[PDB]
Structures are given as structure tokens and as C-alpha cells.
Write a protein that binds this ligand. Structure first.
Ligand SMILES: [Ca+2]
Length: 120
């Protein structure tokens, strides 16, 4: 009954860090290199929380969140936006798509863990 996390970020390093930090903590973690892969993974497995980088090469975190929120099982699933630069503006966009919270890059393991707990 481990909480399932889907972490989306094109960065291999970020994906490894999040996956490593979270799995070591005790989460079941799947990562996706992009929004399309993330959406495919989200449709076959039931994630309890989704972490999405804001700026990715193809599908942005906002469009990914907008899309995943269309999947009925993710109508209310907590979603955390990951980014190096939050802005009053980005946070508004995050509200129009349904984002739940924000995580600032770079994060140390501790902050990542406490942030997930607040939405879970
Ligand atoms: Ca990125």
C-alpha cells in the first residue's frame, strides 16, 4: 500500500534524484521523461500524487497537468509543480490547470519529502 508517485521531468539527473530520494524514503515511484510518457503511465497505473516539472522540451508541466486532470482518476489527485523560478504569474497558470502546490529547484531531499506530505 505504498503511495504511488509519478515524477515528470526531462532531466535524467532530476528524475534519478527524485526517484532515488522518494524510493529510499518509501514511495513507489515511476518517472516519465515527458508529458506524453507520463500520461501513458498515468492511464495504466493509479498514482496518488504527480510531480511535474514546469519547463520541459515538449509538453509543458501546465499542459500536462491540464491533460492529466481530464483523466477521471486524476480529477483531484494532488499535483506538485517543480521549477527553479516560481512567479506570481506561474502560480496563477497553475491554478487555471489545477495544480496543487509548488516545489522549488534545486531542492534538498528534506524539502521534497515535506512538500509531498502536505498534499498527501
Ligand atoms: Ca525541465
Amino acid at each position: 500500500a505504498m503511495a504511488k508517485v509519478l515524477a515528470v521531468d526531462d532531466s535524467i539527473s532530476i528524475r534519478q534524484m527524485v526517484s532515488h530520494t522518494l524510493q529510499d524514503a518509501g514511495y513507489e515511484v515511476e518517472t516519465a521523461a515527458d508529458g506524453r510518457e507520463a500520461l501513458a503511465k498515468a492511464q495504466k497505473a493509479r498514482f496518488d500524487v504527480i510531480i511535474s516539472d514546469v519547463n520541459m522540451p515538449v509538453m509543458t508541466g501546465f499542459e500536462f497537468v491540464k491533460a492529466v486532470r481530464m483523466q477521471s482518476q486524476y480529477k483531484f489527485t494532488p499535483i506538485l509543480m517543480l521549477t527553479t523560478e516560481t512567479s506570481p504569474e506561474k502560480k496563477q497558470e497553475g491554478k487555471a490547470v489545477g495544480a496543487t502546490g509548488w516545489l522549488v529547484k534545486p531542492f534538498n531531499p528534506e524539502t521534497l519529502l515535506k512538500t509531498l506530505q502536505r498534499v498527501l
